[PDB]
Design a protein around this ligand. Structure first.
Ligand code: NAG
Ligand code: NAG
Lengths: 49, 211, 49
């Protein structure tokens, strides 16, 4: 009785890393709902200096 | 290689052109095309840099241009002394660095001459010597852009022939020679051979038949 | 005899923005014809010691 995280297919290699951060562990839900959109998340990304 | 016609000449105080007509990906696909000059005995001297540029010296009669896969040089005014070879050159793709073929550039102040041709078949002692050589001599043909072709009874041949580069005589015209190697059984195989020489479009040929 | 552990970039297409870092070692093309990742005619390794 479970939805589980199986694949992570993003990159092949990662050679010369400069910055790295990893948050504290948690566990999301991953369960597929069937209602209406219940969550809005908004982000602003800027890149200066 | 690249292509340039091996003979071009004109009157002193005029404009002569020389075409380099390379392919793409060395001359058409680039811009680093140069022109050199070699007097008979010296090192080459850089005469024209990229496309149309000059070093110091180099009096402004020489000019260059490029119109696609054909770059060209033009001398505007033969003083007396710009007889040279004028190799064109290009940078090809992978550091290749190709070259040209070389064009003699004379200035016959007078009237062109006729290449006197003379042909000799293999002597008798050579026939007894189990070998055979045809001898084609060319002489007195002012402007030196001669070329030669050899003929068996009806067909051209391209094996066993050696051709001297033209050499200047005392009268300041040229002379040349070519040799044809044959086994005597091939000498009597074909009923006759000939040496033809072409010179400024014109052509003269001589012919000899075995006995 | 020299210490060659310290390097600097000598060639780039444009100036850096402030506070960025360029650790790429792609071969700088000084000419009009490309060179496909070999050093040679008008193509230089962009880092010197
Ligand atoms: C990145 O990787 C390449 C090849 O593995 C290496 O030459 C280079 O030194 C690395 N970068 C740094 C900052 O060490
Ligand atoms: C950012 O990357 C682009 C790649 O298209 C490059 O053209 C540009 O010069 C880079 N930024 C700077 C400041 O050079």
């Amino acid at each position: 009785k479970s939805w589980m995280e199986s694949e992570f297919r993003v990159y092949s290699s990662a050679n010369n890393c400069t910055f790295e951060y990893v948050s504290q562990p948690f566990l999301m839900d991953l369960e597929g709902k069937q209602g209406n959109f219940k969550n809005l998340r908004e982000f602003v990304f800027k890149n200066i200096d | 290689a690249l292509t340039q016609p091996p003979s071009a000449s004109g009157s002193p105080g005029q404009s002569v052109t020389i075409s380099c007509t390379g392919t793409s990906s060395d001359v058409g696909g680039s811009n680093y095309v140069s022109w050199y000059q070699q007097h008979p005995g010296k090192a080459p001297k850089l005469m024209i840099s990229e496309v149309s540029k000059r070093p110091s010296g180099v009096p402004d009669r020489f000019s260059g241009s490029k119109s696609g896969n054909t770059a060209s040089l033009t001398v505007s005014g033969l003083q007396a002394e710009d007889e040279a070879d004028y190799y064109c050159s290009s940078y090809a793709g992978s550091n290749n660095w190709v070259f040209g073929g070389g064009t003699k550039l004379t200035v016959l102040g007078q009237p062109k001459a006729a290449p006197s041709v003379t042909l000799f078949p293999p002597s008798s002692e050579e026939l007894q010597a189990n070998k055979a050589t045809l001898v084609c001599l060319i002489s007195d043909f002012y402007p030196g852009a001669v070329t030669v072709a050899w003929k068996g009874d009806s067909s051209p041949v391209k094996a066993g022939v050696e051709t001297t580069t033209p050499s200047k005589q005392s009268n300041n015209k040229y002379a040349a020679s070519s040799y044809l190697s044959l086994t005597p059984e091939q000498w009597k195989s074909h009923r006759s051979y000939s040496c033809q020489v072409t010179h400024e479009g014109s052509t003269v040929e001589k012919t000899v038949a075995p006995t | 005899g020299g210490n060659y552990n310290y390097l600097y970039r000598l060639f780039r297409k444009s100036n850096l923005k402030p506070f960025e870092r360029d650790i790429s070692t792609e071969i700088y093309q000084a000419g009009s014809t490309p060179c496909n990742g070999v050093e040679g005619f008008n193509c230089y390794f962009p880092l010197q010691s």
